[PDB]
Amino acid sequence: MDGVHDLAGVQGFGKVPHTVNADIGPTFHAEWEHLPYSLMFAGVAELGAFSVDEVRYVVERMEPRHYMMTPYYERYVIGVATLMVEKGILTQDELESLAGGPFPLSRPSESEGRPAPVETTTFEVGQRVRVRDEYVPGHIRMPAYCRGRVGTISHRTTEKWPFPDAIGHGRNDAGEEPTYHVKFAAEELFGSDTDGGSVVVDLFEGYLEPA
Amino acid sequence: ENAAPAQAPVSDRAWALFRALDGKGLVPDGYVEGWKKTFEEDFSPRRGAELVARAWTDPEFRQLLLTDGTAAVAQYGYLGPQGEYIVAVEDTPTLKNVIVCSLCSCTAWPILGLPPTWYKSFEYRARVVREPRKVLSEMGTEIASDIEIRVYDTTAETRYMVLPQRPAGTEGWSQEQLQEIVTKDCLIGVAIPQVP
Ligand SMILES: [Fe+3]
Ligand SMILES: [Mg+2]
Prior knowledge:
The complex is a heterodimer.
Chain A: H1 35-46, H2 52-60, H3 64-69, H4 72-86, H5 92-99, E1 128-131, E2 150-156, H6 164-167, E3 179-185, H7 186-190, E4 198-204, E5 208-210
Helix pairs in contact in A: 1-4, 2-4
Chain B: H1 10-22, H2 31-42, H3 45-57, H4 59-67, H5 69-75, E1 86-90, E2 95-100, H6 109-112, H7 122-127, H8 132-139, E3 148-153, E4 159-163, H9 175-180, H10 184-188
Parallel strand pairs in B: 1-4, 2-3
Helix pairs in contact in B: 3-4, 4-5
Residues 101, 103-106 of chain B line the site of fe (iii) ion (FE).
């Protein structure tokens, strides 16, 4: 999904609000802030109602201005509430009654997702690969800066996981794939307009093709 | 135009979500409290610091951590949520590694702790992939021109930690002494361990 959450490479932001080893304060800065992650795990592991991938996607589905002005932990409150309503566990009406006021949710999905690709290749360390030049309107774990770009395999995972573009939509056809650490030269991604060296992206097999 | 939607106070919304689920019996007793404790007390950059100090004084462990990080971490019992497949990436005199999650916040929680607010910021998520030298400089870390900076974007299930170089002036230190100078920011890769 080419949403505003795909921030790598966007220009115009200011300084990162941190200098090295500065105080970051406590783990939680408000008494509610452990609820989004804790209720995410309740949903995943206790209720079996959704996957972690479905939480990443429902946060991607926040209305774009809403995403941009919402603090991190609040995005996951909104997202987990949204999934509880979509999965039929809660209603928006009861959330708003309990909350004492409006509780707008993420927007409905505009894609049914897609299955794990049937045709893929097992790549070896050292091989040159290109990120498939594909556009996916639902969930995908490919930041747009690397779409179509060429890099080198530095690692093939020794484990496999369900394809995000499928399990992030709750589908039954996510299969399992390894991922690859793909090393790109900075110049490949951003031409002259970078001060970096290399960028390694951890890409599912189904996002890659031989260069 | 472009105005924010009307919303109840975020604490009221977050507790409403809790109460709606808990009142239907869907949240076990002490469940969210249990997680709060895990997040605050168990998941911790002091674990990653312990791993680095061991690697710095034990070549064989260093090799294990760099080739099978998961197995290395498991010897300490530090595998966990958002830290089940671990890769440690080694800094060298010509390479500085830095970790981000440009798409959200992905972090090796059990050995780095939950990410700090700055790592989840839009500034860091947008900028460090494209201009990591300037970002680190602004953050107080100068990386010379003939050192390659390598940014790992955490886009799948691999969960990373940086193995920084061991600074001179620590020869013969104990693992306790070494662990003390390995901070959270050293493990993310934005800082270099400092010797008094
Ligand atoms: Fe993330
Ligand atoms: Mg985009």
